[PDB]
Amino acid sequence: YEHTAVMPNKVGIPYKALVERPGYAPVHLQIQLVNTRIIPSTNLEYITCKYKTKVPSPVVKCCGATQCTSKPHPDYQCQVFTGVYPFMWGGAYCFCDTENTQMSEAYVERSEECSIDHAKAYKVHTGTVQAMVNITYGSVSWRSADVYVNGETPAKIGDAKLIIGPLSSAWSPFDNKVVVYGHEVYNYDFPEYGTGKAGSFGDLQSRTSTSNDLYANTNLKLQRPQAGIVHTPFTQAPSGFERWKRDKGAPLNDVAPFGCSIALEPLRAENCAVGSIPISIDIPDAAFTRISETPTVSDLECKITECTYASDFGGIATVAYKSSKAGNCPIHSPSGVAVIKENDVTLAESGSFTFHFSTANIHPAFKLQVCTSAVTCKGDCKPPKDHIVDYPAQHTESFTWSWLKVLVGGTSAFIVLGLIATAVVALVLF
Amino acid sequence: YEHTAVMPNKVGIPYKALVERPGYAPVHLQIQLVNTRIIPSTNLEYITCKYKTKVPSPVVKCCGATQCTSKPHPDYQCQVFTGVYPFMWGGAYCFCDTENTQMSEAYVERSEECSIDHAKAYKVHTGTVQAMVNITYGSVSWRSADVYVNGETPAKIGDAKLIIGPLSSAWSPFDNKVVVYGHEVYNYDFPEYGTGKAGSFGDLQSRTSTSNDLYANTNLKLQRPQAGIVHTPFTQAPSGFERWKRDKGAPLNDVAPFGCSIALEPLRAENCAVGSIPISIDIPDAAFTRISETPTVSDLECKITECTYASDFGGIATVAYKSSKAGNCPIHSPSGVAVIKENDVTLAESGSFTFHFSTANIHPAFKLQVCTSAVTCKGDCKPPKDHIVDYPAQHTESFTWSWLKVLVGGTSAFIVLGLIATAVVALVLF
Amino acid sequence: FTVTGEGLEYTWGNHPPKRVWAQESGEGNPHGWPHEVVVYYYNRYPLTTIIGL
Numbered sequence: 043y044e045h046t047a048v049m050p051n052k053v054g055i056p057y058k059a060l061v062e063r064p065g066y067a068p069v070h071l072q073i074q075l076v077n078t079r080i081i082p083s084t085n086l087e088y089i090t091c092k093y094k095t096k097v098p099s100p101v102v103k104c105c106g107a108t109q110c111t112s113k114p115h116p117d118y119q120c121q122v123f124t125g126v127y128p129f130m131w132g133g134a135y136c137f138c139d140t141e142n143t144q145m146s147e148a149y150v151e152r153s154e155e156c157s158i159d160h161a162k163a164y165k166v167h168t169g170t171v172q173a174m175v176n177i178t179y180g181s182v183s184w185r186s187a188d189v190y191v192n193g194e195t196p197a198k199i200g201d202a203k204l205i206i207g208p209l210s211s212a213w214s215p216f217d218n219k220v221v222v223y224g225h226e227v228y229n230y231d232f233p234e235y236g237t238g239k240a241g242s243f244g245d246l247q248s249r250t251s252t253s254n255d256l257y258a259n260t261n262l263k264l265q266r267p268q269a270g271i272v273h274t275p276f277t278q279a280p281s282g283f284e285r286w287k288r289d290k291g292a293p294l295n296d297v298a299p300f301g302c303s304i305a306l307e308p309l310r311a312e313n314c315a316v317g318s319i320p321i322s323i324d325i326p327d328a329a330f331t332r333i334s335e336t337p338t339v340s341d342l343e344c345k346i347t348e349c350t351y352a353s354d355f356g357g358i359a360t361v362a363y364k365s366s367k368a369g370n371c372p373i374h375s376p377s378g379v380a381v382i383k384e385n386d387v388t389l390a391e392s393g394s395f396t397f398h399f400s401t402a403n404i405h406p407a408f409k410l411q412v413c414t415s416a417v418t419c420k421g422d423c424k425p426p427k428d429h430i431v432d433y434p435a436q437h438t439e440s441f442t443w444s445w446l447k448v449l450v451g452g453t454s455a456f457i458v459l460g461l462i463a464t465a466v467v468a469l470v471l472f
Numbered sequence: 473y474e475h476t477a478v479m480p481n482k483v484g485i486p487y488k489a490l491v492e493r494p495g496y497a498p499v500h501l502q503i504q505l506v507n508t509r510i511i512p513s514t515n516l517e518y519i520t521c522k523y524k525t526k527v528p529s530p531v532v533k534c535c536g537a538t539q540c541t542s543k544p545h546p547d548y549q550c551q552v553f554t555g556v557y558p559f560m561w562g563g564a565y566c567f568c569d570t571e572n573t574q575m576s577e578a579y580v581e582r583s584e585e586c587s588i589d590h591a592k593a594y595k596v597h598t599g600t601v602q603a604m605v606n607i608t609y610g611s612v613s614w615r616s617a618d619v620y621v622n623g624e625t626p627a628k629i630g631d632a633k634l635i636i637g638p639l640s641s642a643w644s645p646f647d648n649k650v651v652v653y654g655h656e657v658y659n660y661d662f663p664e665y666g667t668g669k670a671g672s673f674g675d676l677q678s679r680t681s682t683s684n685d686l687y688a689n690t691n692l693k694l695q696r697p698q699a700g701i702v703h704t705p706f707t708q709a710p711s712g713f714e715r716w717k718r719d720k721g722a723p724l725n726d727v728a729p730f731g732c733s734i735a736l737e738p739l740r741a742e743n744c745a746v747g748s749i750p751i752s753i754d755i756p757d758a759a760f761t762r763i764s765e766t767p768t769v770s771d772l773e774c775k776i777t778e779c780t781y782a783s784d785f786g787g788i789a790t791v792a793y794k795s796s797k798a799g800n801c802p803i804h805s806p807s808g809v810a811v812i813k814e815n816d817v818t819l820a821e822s823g824s825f826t827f828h829f830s831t832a833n834i835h836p837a838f839k840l841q842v843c844t845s846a847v848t849c850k851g852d853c854k855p856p857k858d859h860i861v862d863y864p865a866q867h868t869e870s871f872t873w874s875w876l877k878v879l880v881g882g883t884s885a886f887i888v889l890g891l892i893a894t895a896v897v898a899l900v901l902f
Numbered sequence: 903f904t905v906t907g908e909g910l911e912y913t914w915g916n917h918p919p920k921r922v923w924a925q926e927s928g929e930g931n932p933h934g935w936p937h938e939v940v941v942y943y944y945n946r947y948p949l950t951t952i953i954g955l
């Protein structure tokens with residue numbers, strides 16, 4: 043009875059399959075993939091952030107040169123300068139006039155915001171998707187367990203053992219290269235650690251926040267201070283983290299395909315509704331009811347009464363239940379045409395009880411399996427009026443004949459008329 | 473002069489290319505890829521280790537039943553048992569004889585060795601390869617810097633800026649799924665977290681060492697203690713970590729292809745000699761010598777004297793140097809046929825100095841560029857005798873005519889004789 | 903151990919791993935005879951010469 047089932051990946055709607063174990067009473071499923079959080083395999087490549095030109099205070103030798111050295115600070119820009127007369131609180135102070143030397147030095151350093159307000163690159167691989175699958179199973183009525191997708195993992199939370207996937211729809215909405223910012227995730231071809239052109243994204247490139255080493259292509263170019271005054275012209279591109287916040291691109295939780303949401307959390311991409319998942323469960327046999335205890339319902343009748351050709355469970359149908367005992371009776375349409383709100387219907391001795399459903403074909407010819415008794419609930423449905431609210435329960439759109447059957451049979455009849463005109467020429471011929 | 477160079481991936485041998493900057497004196501390289509440590513992108517999926525059936529001490533109710541409950545311990549196996557008479561230090565102690573009840577309970581727990589002696593699975597992606605490239609450059613004579621492969625990363629350690637790769641030989645010797653043990657790394661299709669069949673590898677599956685939760689399919693089955701005595705039959709598969717240490721497979725540092733070594737360290741795969749790397753350097757122009765200061769060496773002559781058709785630098789050749797000034801002269805064979813031990817040769821006023829080299833073609837017709845003066849060092853070589861020691865400096869094997877030139881020209885001559893027999897029939901014909 | 907051209911490595915127990923250059927030793931192709939010295943070229947290429955011949 044290990045109920046294999048292909049199953050559409052779509053988050054917020056149950057999938058009430060039916061256990062057709064030969065021998066005991068069937069049991070309904072209610073499989074609602076409440077989440078599809080993904081968590082691909084990734085690597086923190088480098089944080090970036092806006093620089094801070096935290097200038098070390100320049101040297102001023104008063105009469106003669108002070109050669110600078112290339113200190114190992116990140117982007118340690120330093121350039122000696124002469125020809126000053128530095129006004130500092132008493133007019134100038136160095137008594138020479140050209141031998142007055144000024145050595146400006148400036149290096150790049152992570153902002154204090156780099157710790158907290160910082161973009162974040164990644165090389166993103168595929169990893170392994172997850173879900174907090176609720177099943178309000180059978181008569182168990184509850185399990186809300188976190189599972190995987192890899193098609194040999196069980197999760198014995200509750201009483202049932204369930205194996206999921208692997209899904210066929212391997213679209214990781216994340217690209218290979220991704221930038222991340224607070225919550226807005228950008229599938230951006232970040233240049234790399236160690237390279238980013240100044241002004242462009244990643245002018246500062248630190249491996250992490252702690253990492254004292256980094257790459258600071260900021261094009262930091264010191265210029266000489268003006269007219270004999272102490273200061274430090276640092277001519278520099280404002281960061282490619284400054285832009286990338288107001289000339290950026292839009293976020294993947296606002297531009298992704300196939301229906302995903304995002305978090306700066308384990309880097310999941312929630313609720314990506316795409317494709318199917320081959321899911322298979324091993325129910326506890328104790329949860330089964332033996333077949334000789336549920337009422338046999340046959341010699342019944344089913345009919346719609348007001349079928350709504352729609353998403354919300356607007357379709358209804360009375361069923362002339364013809365029971366043997368009285369009790370519960372799990373229900374399901376093995377055809378995917380009709381999706382039913384009720385998993386189970388209570389029964390007195392051969393009464394009648396309407397259920398709710400939703401379909402997509404004007405003439406819903408769907409079987410209904412009322413606890414081992416099939417029936418066609420044939421009929422016709424009506425379109426609604428009021429379509430602006432969240433997502434459907436129908437999810438069964440397919441091909442849905444009033445000018446096709448005798449039309450194309452009539453279309454054929456012209457060319458069918460041919461070879462009964464031709465080869466009757468053969469008879470008139472002989 | 474940004475000296476692009478395709479470059480074979482092979483670890484323990486320099487690659488003494490030559491900078492042909494138009495205008496100033498050329499400079500030799502010496503690029504020795506001392507390491508090729510890889511460090512792919514990975515994910516710790518689950519530690520495994522051998523279990524320890526750390527039995528909690530069973531209950532013994534003396535007259536009547538003690539129903540057990542399914543405690544949440546990993547693989548919490550518990551089974552009530554009756555029909556005992558437990559001999560405990562005074563003969564039995566429970567005065568009944570069948571109502572004597574014994575409730576055995578046992579759960580699986582990480583060994584103390586799990587912290588330290590433990591296999592370790594991984595989902596392994598590709599990541600980014602590295603190297604401590606020494607260049608004893610030019611006259612700089614030193615830099616031993618750690619670099620990357622991604623073809624826009626510089627590493628300004630020393631004075632030169634160098635961009636490496638991306639390599640074309642993307643064989644990650646790691647497979648997708650890998651198990652790791654201490655130092656022996658196994659490219660094993662570990663089943664998964666949460667699934668591993670008992671006895672098989674990963675019967676215990678803990679996310680990490682700290683993780684109190686795990687998956688313990690050990691097939692732990694308690695049996696009733698015998699003949700009214702206190703103990704706990706735990707019937708269990710010894711671990712799939714017990715096997716996997718003596719019925720395992722061999723390690724990837726003993727079965728990999730294309731020449732790799734391994735460490736339980738950042739999960740590198742060192743020294744993987746395969747393919748080429750498109751490497752490009754921006755030399756410091758200060759390190760250049762202008763062309764008008766090195767001796768011009770032309771009107772020279774080169775000849776082998778004892779060419780050894782071999783790997784070690786057995787090939788030698790005097791060169792009748794014909795200099796203008798006297799000094800150093802960097803050397804290189806732009807043809808890859810000959811690999812030379814000497815980067816630089818000192819020169820008096822038009823002397824002679826032998827160098828060492830190695831080749832692979834019987835008739836080494838390789839150019840030699842003695843600081844802007846080419847020369848063919850044509851000759852013939854001798855095979856050695858003594859081939860059992862580590863790896864070569866030659867690494868230049870290619871196609872290497874004594875019965876092919878006039879042979880196939882003679883082979884052709886038969887069929888060339890054809891169409892000068894045929895179409896001369898046309899003349900005799902007219 | 904059929905060592906190849908590029909190299910092999912060798913692990914005598916937990917003694918450290920060795921490594922080995924095995925280029926030729928079958929003496930290439932010197933020449934003063936008609937063809938029985940070409941074995942040198944065959945002994946270096948006993949895969950391509952069998953078909954190449």
Ligand SMILES: *[C@@H]1O[C@H](CO)[C@@H](O[C@@H]2O[C@H](CO)[C@@H](O[C@@H]3O[C@H](CO)[C@@H](O)[C@H](O)[C@H]3NC(C)=O)[C@H](O)[C@H]2NC(C)=O)[C@H](O)[C@H]1NC(C)=O
Pocket residue numbers: 074076174176177178186
């Ligand atoms: C399991 O599948 C169910 C599919 O509908 C969902 O579970 C729902 O959980 C809700 C909160 O636990 C319940 O709401 C409560 O219902 C009771 C009984 O009707 C009310 O008294 C409470 O007021 C109400 N709570 C609130 C805040 O209104 C739902 O009843 C319950 N669903 C059903 C059908 O009973 C979830 O999708 C899923 N559970 C998960 C993911 O935890």
Ligand SMILES: *[C@@H]1O[C@H](CO)[C@@H](O[C@@H]2O[C@H](CO)[C@@H](O[C@@H]3O[C@H](CO)[C@@H](O)[C@H](O)[C@H]3NC(C)=O)[C@H](O)[C@H]2NC(C)=O)[C@H](O)[C@H]1NC(C)=O
Pocket residue numbers: 504506604606607608616
């Ligand atoms: C740089 O490329 C060089 C290629 O040969 C290698 O660098 C080698 O480093 C060794 C240790 O620093 C040197 O050995 C020392 O050499 C001096 C001078 O000859 C001797 O006095 C010392 O005794 C000797 N040390 C020992 C322990 O014997 C080598 O001389 C030096 N190579 C050359 C050509 O000078 C390395 O491959 C690379 N350096 C790295 C990776 O750090």
